[PDB]
């Protein structure tokens, strides 16, 4: 049975080293058996998991009251946090399945 993937926004986020950067992951769940993961793409071109909801400390996920949206925040961004990020919804039942968001970019700049 088809279901839509989460969306992940904005497409590009630019911040200076030391600031925070927040993406928004949006998921229209059709039931309550799911979990949301936040990933980054490794040099290897492999998803590295950063955090999940429900629940290193620099990567935080927060579920908003609207029952759709999640804030995914890099606290105290560093230059080497620059790269490609995505979120993934995992259906837990009736069939365990992951659907990935589109990928977005973080650029973390040198403080002048």
């Amino acid at each position, epitope marked *: 049975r088809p279901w839509n993937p989460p969306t992940f926004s*904005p*497409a*590009l*986020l*630019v*911040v*200076t080293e*030391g*600031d*925070n*950067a*927040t993406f*928004t992951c949006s998921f229209s769940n059709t039931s309550e058996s799911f979990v949301l993961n936040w990933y980054r793409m490794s040099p290897s071109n492999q998803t590295d998991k950063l955090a999940a909801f429900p629940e290193d400390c620099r990567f935080r996920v927060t579920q908003l009251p609207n029952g759709r949206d999640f*804030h995914m925040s890099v606290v105290r961004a560093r230059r080497n946090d620059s790269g490609t990020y995505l979120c993934g919804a995992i259906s837990l039942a009736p069939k365990a399945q992951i659907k990935e968001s*589109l*990928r*977005a*970019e973080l*650029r973390v*700049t*040198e403080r002048r």
Partner: antibody
Amino acid sequence: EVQLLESGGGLVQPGGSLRLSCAASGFTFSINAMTWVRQAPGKGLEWVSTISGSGFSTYYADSLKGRFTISRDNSKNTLYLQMNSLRAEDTAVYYCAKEVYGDYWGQGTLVTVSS
Amino acid sequence: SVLTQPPSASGTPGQRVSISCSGASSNIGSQSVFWYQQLPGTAPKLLIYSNNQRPSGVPDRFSGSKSGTSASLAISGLRSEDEADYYCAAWDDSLSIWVFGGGTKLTVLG
């Protein structure tokens, strides 16, 4: 849903200064990067400045030579552009836009630099 | 502008037109390309994000691609309503700036 409304445009004398405002609604402003872009009559878009949600990261076109300051007040859902030492060449429509890349744009406000 | 586009482009109704955007390794080569449509008398609107994705409201007649330091916007099924100025843009990681291309005026002849 998203709405962006510029104000503060109009006539200013050469060497003068002006502050533009942009009022935002329909999204979570405090975490959202915000941008100014301008466009002189009959010419191309020129990126001016972007500010991070917190205000702690700001970027500027090199051509401005630090005459402009971007700022924001998350309390009021408002973005600002302070423009100083204005020259004829600054005459343009100034657009407020959401994100560094402008997923949504205001309708713009015309700044005319003239005596 | 450091993203160069043809100043003009044209086709006739129903045809396919392509608008190029040329950059460098520090921008198009390593960063996502975005495109904008600016109809006469209006503010720009986002047309393509992340090289090739369409925001909601944008028909599938518009597509984007990128290879190396060049990118392209294609418009299939050209219509009168497509007459507009089109811009590409991208981040430049060598100067830490956002750059708009110089813009392309699209006319629909015939």
